[PDB]
Amino acid sequence: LYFQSMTLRLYSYWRSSSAWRVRLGLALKGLAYEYRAVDLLAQEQFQAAHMSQVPVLEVEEDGRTHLLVQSMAILEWLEERHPEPALLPPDLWGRARVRALAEHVNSGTQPMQNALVLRMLREKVPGWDREWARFFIARGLAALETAVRDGAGRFSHGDAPTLADCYLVPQLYNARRFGLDLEPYPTLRRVDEACAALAPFQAAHPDRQPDAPPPDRRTP
């Protein structure tokens, strides 16, 4: 049953792009949740000098707890459980398109720049991790720019936000982090600007999260 007293708890790190996607689905659906910070920096530093993954959406209903993992799985659950406002359109072609744009990020871009990948690159070849990240992010953004520019609306798919924007916006933030020039992706930059003006996008941004450090205490 779609029991209505579910409470939600998100395990999140302020600048995790994977967690940010889920923050965006939650914000866009107008869903309240408890923020449970997971300090991935502390865990990295502790593990170095010698498991907890993000996102996890914990759903509690009357003494039963469900732990939902994988951003895409979590977002598809949100869309089934709370269908309005829809972040997938009702037509099947559009659904496939939106899922493909999400997957270009989910599977095609982010994994190549995740923190474990980058750490293992730069252990073998100092400095190369950031060059690698820029290469693979640029490749993913080029695929997106082409696939989006196709009959583009104001957003990645039509004239309202969808799951595709939930994946695009955090990925462009990571692109900027690594110093990738975004000049070649004008459609993506336009979409990013349209999203940035919306209250739910503002709410989900890293800088607004409970665990966000001030600017002068952030690593690159």
Ligand X SMILES: N[C@@H](CCC(=O)N[C@@H](CS[C@H](CC(=O)O)C(=O)O)C(=O)NCC(=O)O)C(=O)O
Q: How many CB atoms lie within 10 A of CB 125?
A: 11
Tell me which of a copy of itself, ligand X, none is bound by residue 44, counting a contact when its beta carbon lies within the kind-specific cut-off of 5 to 8 angstroms.
ligand X
Rounded to a whole number of angstroms, the minimum distance from the CB of residue 83 to ligand X is 22
Residue 135 phi, psi dihedral angles, 5° rounding: -60, -50
Residue list, annotated binding site for glutathione: 18, 21, 43, 47, 52, 54, 71, 106, 110, 139
Q: Is 52 in the site for ligand X (CB under 6 A)?
A: yes
Judged by CB under 6 A, does residue 115 bind ligand X?
yes
Residues forming a β-bridge with 56: 11, 69
Spell out the residues 6+ positions from residue 203 whose beta carbon is closer than 8 angstroms to its own.
23, 27
Exposed/middle/buried for residue 52 (C-beta within 10 Å: 0-12, 13-18, 19+): exposed
Q: Judged by CB under 8 A, which of 24, 68, 141, 169 binds a copy of itself?
A: 68
Interface of this chain with ligand X, residues 121 to 180, rule: CB under 6 A: 174
Measure the CA–CA gap between 25 and 8, rounded to whole angstroms.
13
Instruction: Choose, by CB under 6 A, the member of 10, 12, 14, 16 that binds ligand X.
Output: 16
* One character per residue 169-208, x = contact with a copy of itself (rule: CB under 8 A): ----------------------------------------
Closest to 201 (Cα-Cα) out of 191, 214, 211, 210: 191
Interface with a copy of itself in residues 130-169 (CB under 8 A): 132, 135, 139, 142-143, 147
